[PDB]
Amino acid sequence: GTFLFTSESVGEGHPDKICDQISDAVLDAHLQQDPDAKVACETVAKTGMILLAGEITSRAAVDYQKVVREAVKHIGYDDSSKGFDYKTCNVLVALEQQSPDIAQGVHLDRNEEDIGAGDQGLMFGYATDETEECMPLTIVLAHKLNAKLAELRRNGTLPWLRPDSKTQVTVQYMQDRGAVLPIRVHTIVISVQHDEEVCLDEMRDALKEKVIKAVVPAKYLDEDTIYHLQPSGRFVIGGPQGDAGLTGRKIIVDTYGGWGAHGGGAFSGKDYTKVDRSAAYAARWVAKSLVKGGLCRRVLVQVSYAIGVSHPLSISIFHYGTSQKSERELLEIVKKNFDLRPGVIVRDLDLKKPIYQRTAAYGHFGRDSFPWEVPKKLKY
């Protein structure tokens, strides 16, 4: 009845995550002036470079140099000794207007509620009762380990820490009538960029005592738990210098850590008309509503769209054997309670609000009571 499952997370200074945060800082900057901005901003990061590439049609006047550098400053890359500096890096911009062919097929001369999906695609929502926030324990722990590293870096407890980090948590679970019950942490990995002065043993001791023990409850750790702390042995070169980053390269870290399912679409740098983000947020909202409403213990929701068409093409619900209701019954409850057209999701989830940079590290789900995390009271 037991099995292992592993999920990973990355820190704010992981190069892919830098890109997601910059893409969302650009989106937020546009939404602060023009709530109806059409934004599709990709970011690429490599040694000394932030490149913005994509399409934006907006009435906002945005200073890309300032927005980008302020996001990098927040992350903590502020000196050439760290491998990257917001003050002196290159910021290159290759942004054009949104394609008029896309604009005419999606939103031009359309009533807001009846705007078409900004692209075709499939999206999933997932929820599990194994935690109060309805998220898998593996991914919650992996995110919290990265957040702890950033906290200790920012408060000066471990001044040798740099912003680039990755974590990985393997949990041993028990199966329970379709639901899953965490038993213990089997393995933890932590890799984090560091300065030239700190030694390996000092880092491994700090990662176990000040990071793992400050995050993971002792009841999950035992004599058999395996620790891989700084397993490469040296991580002085990091951030974009160590590895090129791109927007939308951490989509499993952004969602459920491998649990549930994923349709492939990235979230960051996109306004609400891009259903890769809005419909995944709405699907999470449906999934969490079905679990918090007591209809299932674990649930997966798939939706799909065609570019230019408002209603989803398909809707599917899998309850893993944790509901007394059939999929047909759950679909009827979802039809009575939710409208998954993008032009209605924007109203229900307040998706013109500039809160997107806040979503771009530590996962988009299970945190901070964003609108998609507040369950809808179901009527049936």
Add this chain to the structure above:
Amino acid sequence: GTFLFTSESVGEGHPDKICDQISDAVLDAHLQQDPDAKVACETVAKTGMILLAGEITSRAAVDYQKVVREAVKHIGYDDSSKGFDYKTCNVLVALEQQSPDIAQGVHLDRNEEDIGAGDQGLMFGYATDETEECMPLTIVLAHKLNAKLAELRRNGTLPWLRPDSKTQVTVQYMQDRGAVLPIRVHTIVISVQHDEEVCLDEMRDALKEKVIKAVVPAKYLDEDTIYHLQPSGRFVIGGPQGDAGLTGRKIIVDTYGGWGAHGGGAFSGKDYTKVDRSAAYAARWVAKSLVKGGLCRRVLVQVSYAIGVSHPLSISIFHYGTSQKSERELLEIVKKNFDLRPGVIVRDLDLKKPIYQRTAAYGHFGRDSFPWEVPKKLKY
């Protein structure tokens, strides 16, 4: 007992797919001269630009301008009227050596069989007996629709076609003791870039008669099947001009179309030491071996690694209720038959061979009898 499932695919000229193909053309160019090249090549594409960003340590002498332009020529972007031209586009290179900190922690002074994983991460393998090639019907049909568009473009049957395309297929399935049985095609979407002269009705008629009917068996199509053909109404602007592309932004199209599971890692532009690719290929090989070996009808395999460590940290197998054997029994069979260290996977799957550009469109799995598609005969 019935449910819907949707998967999508994209064509060779979809901007994200252009990037995957270029990244793998660069990898292959290096492997042709240096089988032990360390390659981590990301590609970004936007109007008039191909940018290579990443890390390569190799003894090869590669002409990036030639390799990139030849890949774009193969795809079909050869004139400014199509929105992109291999002869006249900008090719920018931001490639540095692999970080010496990564090299020392992964492969320097290590016996090949005992090389460490090139990064941490989780990867999944999946197989289903619903098709001979052990792939979901949704994704097989979606890929074949894009391949058909490219065939008709290249043979001059539909000369108004351009290389950028997307497809999406929704199938209605029946559940069968954990396995799934396709019943009918519920919805098909096709969007494809086209010239300024062809009209919408001519395109919709050709897509139904010359593309859908030439790919999807009539037994799956009926009076209720929904068709969304050129649903945006106009798609003249396309390729990188219509939407910025990046390597590793089609990871669900590259794998199982949403079925099974995904660990988040991209495949293209990476040599065998990057377990995001080699361990996902090995996991597919294990999954397909368990189904073709008659041990299960449907199976999911998870593996995970830590950077610098050769053996996987965890291995898990889920058979969806389609095996008489327990997960413990299947894990023992996998342990007796497979060695999932990257330095052994490279030998079993011949991963220094320069065949990677061939994998970078139409999915990495279920095609062409690549080594990971040839089942291993299991001994137990």
